Amino acid sequence: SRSHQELISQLLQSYMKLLLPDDEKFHGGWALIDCDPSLIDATHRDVDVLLLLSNSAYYVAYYDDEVDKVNQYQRLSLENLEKIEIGPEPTLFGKPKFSCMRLHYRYKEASGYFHTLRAVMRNPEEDGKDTLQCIAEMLQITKQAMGSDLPIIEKKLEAKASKPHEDII
Amino acid sequence: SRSHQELISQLLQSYMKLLLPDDEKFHGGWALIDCDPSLIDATHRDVDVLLLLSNSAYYVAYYDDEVDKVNQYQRLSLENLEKIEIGPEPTLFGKPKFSCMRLHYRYKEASGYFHTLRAVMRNPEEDGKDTLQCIAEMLQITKQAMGSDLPIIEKKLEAKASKPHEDII
Amino acid sequence: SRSHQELISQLLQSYMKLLLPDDEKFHGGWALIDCDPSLRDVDVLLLLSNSAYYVAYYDDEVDKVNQYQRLSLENLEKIEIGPEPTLFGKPKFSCMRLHYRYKEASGYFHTLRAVMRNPEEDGKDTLQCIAEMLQITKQAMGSDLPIIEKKLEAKASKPHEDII
Amino acid sequence: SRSHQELISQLLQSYMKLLLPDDEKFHGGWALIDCDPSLIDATHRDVDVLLLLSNSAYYVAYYDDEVDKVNQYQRLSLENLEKIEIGPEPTLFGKPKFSCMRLHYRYKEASGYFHTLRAVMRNPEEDGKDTLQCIAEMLQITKQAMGSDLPIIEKKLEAKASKPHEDII
């Protein structure tokens, strides 16, 4: 009775209804990599990051390095997204290799909390800046529909780690 | 047992795993609206469209207006995406308001198949062209990463309908 | 007798009159560099009127023009903007390809890039802008002009011939 | 003997040497129109303006309405160009459809001197903002290699005329 299309369709419906609250509607989603240098071990390893955008919130979810699972998750209201900075990666040595985007957010009435992300670039000689500008512009345009401005600022990224990230529902 | 946070994270990883085939990775996804005049009824109601991009394919899902679920679903290999056109909407009379994005694809080795999409915008004084240029750009580099090319063309859009779309897994 | 100023204004008047035919208005002009390999930067002057565009190549060691073309906007088929068709490794910068009909034949094109001071600068925005003026100028006078973003082909244009 | 192409070649050569000082190289040039109410001849028309850019200077020339003749000529050093404002034309009433470009220059250590220009080309449909943005971006990129930075502000333009312009060599 039920066809492949009907099954994959019903799966899509159910999962838009499970991921987001009833009042929220999907706008955009991007696969990204964590750009902040972590304080763990030597071997350089890409941390997958998922950024999802609705009409009223943006979602940041971090993936475990080796296995397929989510280590850290956050639903963040758009009003608390203060500013976006886009510029050369804050490496601890060498020339910056690519661009990263830093999303600065308000948490428990405080600043110093930020996510620094870059796009998955399969071409080594590709900057990645265009992709991040596009993402920032959609975050901006969406926040503006709520009635609030969001500055997108081009500048060199400060080599600093943002206040410990806590999980948020 | 598991916390509220643990369940949400689990649902998320499971979703991203089910959404695409084993070998594919998610790159990006966007909520859009069908831009071409559809021939069931000639009225004023937006047809919602979901566009997903993997490393090897893009996915187009049309939603029923009455209910929040699919009416049509297509997985389309990136090899078959011929070109993208971006210009003013093909209005049957008078001034075109917004820009639309036309994705020309090859189906059963035949051409003349296309999706015409636009962005959902909360500012009537914004043509949405930048949002569409961004999406086209990600489709372009993704295809360039797999070895081929994808022309993005700025021109006027022609006042013709696409060949009927068929569901494809 | 005339002043320094009066002479300067008269020179400018005379120049804009001499630059183009009686029935043409100047719209825009840009200093560019040849992007294609030749069979040392070659300076290129591109000029735009209401009905035509002008391409003039400069010799590499002397201040002189050695190739000059007036091309009607109706003969400009399409514009391609994308990374330079290099013969080695990574393309440094974007180039703009102006495809034109010459005596009812295709395969003729100029590949040009912007004069860019900062080495960490693509120069794509500058070229997008030039193409946008060529587009609207042609559209007001005649047919539409496609601007295509893609990777440029590693082919060489059909030999350029001079047009008055 | 000398061919036609040879003659136009030496005409182009000598004249790009007569217009500019010996150490100045032509970057760009645009035909524009005065947005501001004329002060020399009060009545409303479309005063032709030529804007030329070299590596160290920009040139502004006002043509006479009836006969083609330079009524006002200014060579202005890029260092004295402090800001560029873009946005709707300054009217006394109602809706401004097209946008203008206001270049503020410092003259004899004093401010309040500006040129308000708009693009010649357009459809009544388009505001002409994109063109002026491109010009602004060439003036910015040129001055910056040479000197101090140049901000481009998007804002409403008062229609406040700018201190009487004096001819400069």
Beta bridge partners of C163: C69
Residues near D67 by beta carbon (within 8 Å), at least 6 away in sequence = none
Q: Looking up tokens 């500012």, which residue turns up?
A: B123
Q: Which of B95, C142, B100, B98 is nearest to D125 (CA)?
A: B95
Q: How far apart are CA C68 and CA C97, in angstroms?
A: 17
Residues near B41 by beta carbon (within 8 Å), at least 6 away in sequence = none
Cβ–Cβ under 8 Å, residues C139 and C117: no
Element containing residue A8 per DSSP (H, E): helix A4-19
Other beta carbons within 10 angstroms of residue D111's beta carbon come to 13
Residues of C in contact with B150 (CB under 8 A): 150
Report the domain count for chain D. 1
Cβ–Cβ under 8 Å, residues D119 and D126: no
Other beta carbons within 10 angstroms of residue B155's beta carbon come to 17
User: Subunits that touch chain D (at least 3 Cβ pairs < 8 angstroms)?
Assistant: C
- Tokens standing for A93? 């040595």
Residues near D123 by beta carbon (within 8 Å), at least 6 away in sequence = C136, C140
Measure CA A120 to chain center: 12
DSSP code for A38: P
Return the percent helix, strand and coil in chain C, to nearest 5. Answer: 25, 35, 45
User: Subunits that touch chain A (at least 3 Cβ pairs < 8 angstroms)?
Assistant: B
Give the CA radius of gyration of chain D: 17
Q: How far apart are CA D152 and CA C4, in angstroms?
A: 34
Q: Looking up tokens 């780690």, which residue turns up?
A: A161
Terminal-to-terminal C-alpha distance of chain B = 37
Q: Is C127 helix (H, G, I), strand (E, B) or coil?
A: helix
Q: Looking up tokens 């636009």, which residue turns up?
A: B118
Q: How far apart are CA A169 and CA B8, in angstroms?
A: 8
Q: How far apart are CA B70 and CA B48, in angstroms?
A: 9
Residues of B in contact with A138 (CB under 8 A): 131, 134
Terminal-to-terminal C-alpha distance of chain D = 38
Resolution, angstroms, 1 dp: 2.6
Distances from the Cα of B42 to the Cα of B37, B46, B65, angstroms: 8, 12, 14
Q: Which amino acid is at D65?
A: D
| Contact across the interface for C13 and D69, Cβ inside 8 Å | yes
Distances from the Cα of A59 to the Cα of A27, A146, B2, B49, angstroms: 12, 17, 21, 21
Q: Which of D48, B102, D120 is nearest to C136 (CA)?
A: D120
Physical contact, D and C (3 or more Cβ pairs within 8 A): yes
Residues of C in contact with D122 (CB under 8 A): 136
**B24-27 long-range contacts, CB within 8 A, separation 24+:** B24/B54, B24/B55, B24/B56, B24/B57, B25/A31, B25/B54, B25/B55, B26/A29, B26/A31, B26/A50, B26/B52, B26/B53, B26/B54, B27/A30, B27/A31, B27/A120, B27/B53, B27/B54, B27/B55, B27/B138, B27/B142
Q: Looking up tokens 């060489």, which residue turns up?
A: C156
By DSSP bridging, strand B81-88 and strand B152-154 are parallel
The reply to whether B50 touches chain C by the CB within 8 Å rule is no
Alpha helices in C20-144 (DSSP H): 124-141
Cβ–Cβ under 8 Å, residues C53 and C46: yes
Cβ–Cβ under 8 Å, residues C136 and D119: no
Residues near B100 by beta carbon (within 8 Å), at least 6 away in sequence = B35, B36, B86, B87, B88, B89, B90, B116, B117, B118, B132, B157
| Contact across the interface for D134 and C129, Cβ inside 8 Å | yes
Q: How far apart are CA C94 and CA C114, in angstroms?
A: 9
Q: Is D139 helix (H, G, I), strand (E, B) or coil?
A: helix
Q: How far apart are CA D39 and CA D42, in angstroms?
A: 5
DSSP string over chain B: ---HHHHHHHHHHHHHHHHS-TT--EEEEEEEEE-SPPSS--S----EEEEEEESSEEEEEEEPSSSSSEEEEEEEEGGGEEEEEEEE---SSS---SEEEEEEEEETTEEEEEEEEEE--S-TT---HHHHHHHHHHHHHHHHHTT----EEESPPPS-PPPPP--B-
How deeply is A156 buried, as exposed, middle or buried, from its count of CB atoms within 10 A (0-12, 13-18, 19+)? exposed
For D65, how many CA atoms within 13 A lie in the half-sphere containing its CB? 9
Q: Looking up tokens 């591109």, which residue turns up?
A: C46
Residues of C in contact with D70 (CB under 8 A): 9-10, 12-13
Distance to chain C for B156, nearest Cα, Å: 8
Using the Cα atoms of residue C89, residue C90, residue C94 and residue C97 in order, give the sign of their dihedral. positive
Phi-psi map region of B12: left, alpha, beta (phi>0 left; psi -120 to 50 alpha): alpha
Terminal-to-terminal C-alpha distance of chain C = 37
Residues near D87 by beta carbon (within 8 Å), at least 6 away in sequence = D99, D100, D154, D155, D156, D157
Distance to chain C for D93, nearest Cα, Å: 29
Phi and psi, residue D133, nearest 5°? -65, -40
Cβ–Cβ under 8 Å, residues A13 and B70: yes
Residue of C nearest to D52 (CA): C29
Q: Which amino acid is at C52?
A: A
Window 24-43 of C: residues touching D by CB (8 A cutoff) are 25-31
| Contact across the interface for B153 and C147, Cβ inside 8 Å | yes
- Tokens standing for B142? 């993704």
User: Subunits that touch chain C (at least 3 Cβ pairs < 8 angstroms)?
Assistant: B, D
Q: Which of D74, D24, D82 is nearest to D54 (CA)?
A: D24
Physical contact, A and D (3 or more Cβ pairs within 8 A): no
Among C135, C145, C148, select the one facing B152 at the smallest CB separation. Answer: C148
- Domain of B78 in residue numbering reads as 1-169
Residues near C57 by beta carbon (within 8 Å), at least 6 away in sequence = C34, C42, C43, C44, C65, C66, C67, C68
Experimental method: X-ray
- Tokens standing for B47? 């047809």
Q: Which of A119, A135, A120 is nearest to A84 (CA)?
A: A135
Q: Which amino acid is at D105?
A: Y
The reply to whether C126 touches chain D by the CB within 8 Å rule is yes
Q: How far apart are CA A67 and CA A52, in angstroms?
A: 21
Physical contact, C and B (3 or more Cβ pairs within 8 A): yes
Q: Is A17 helix (H, G, I), strand (E, B) or coil?
A: helix
Q: How far apart are CA C26 and CA C13, in angstroms?
A: 12
- Tokens standing for A1? 């009775």
By DSSP bridging, strand C108-114 and strand C26-34 are antiparallel
How deeply is C75 buried, as exposed, middle or buried, from its count of CB atoms within 10 A (0-12, 13-18, 19+)? middle
For B87, how many CA atoms within 13 A lie in the half-sphere containing its CB? 18
Beta bridge partners of B34: B117
Residues near C74 by beta carbon (within 8 Å), at least 6 away in sequence = C138, C141, C142, C143
Q: Which amino acid is at B117?
A: L
DSSP code for D124: T
Q: How far apart are CA D105 and CA A110, in angstroms?
A: 42
Q: Which of B106, B109, B85 is nearest to B36 (CA)?
A: B85
Q: How far apart are CA D86 and CA D152, in angstroms?
A: 7
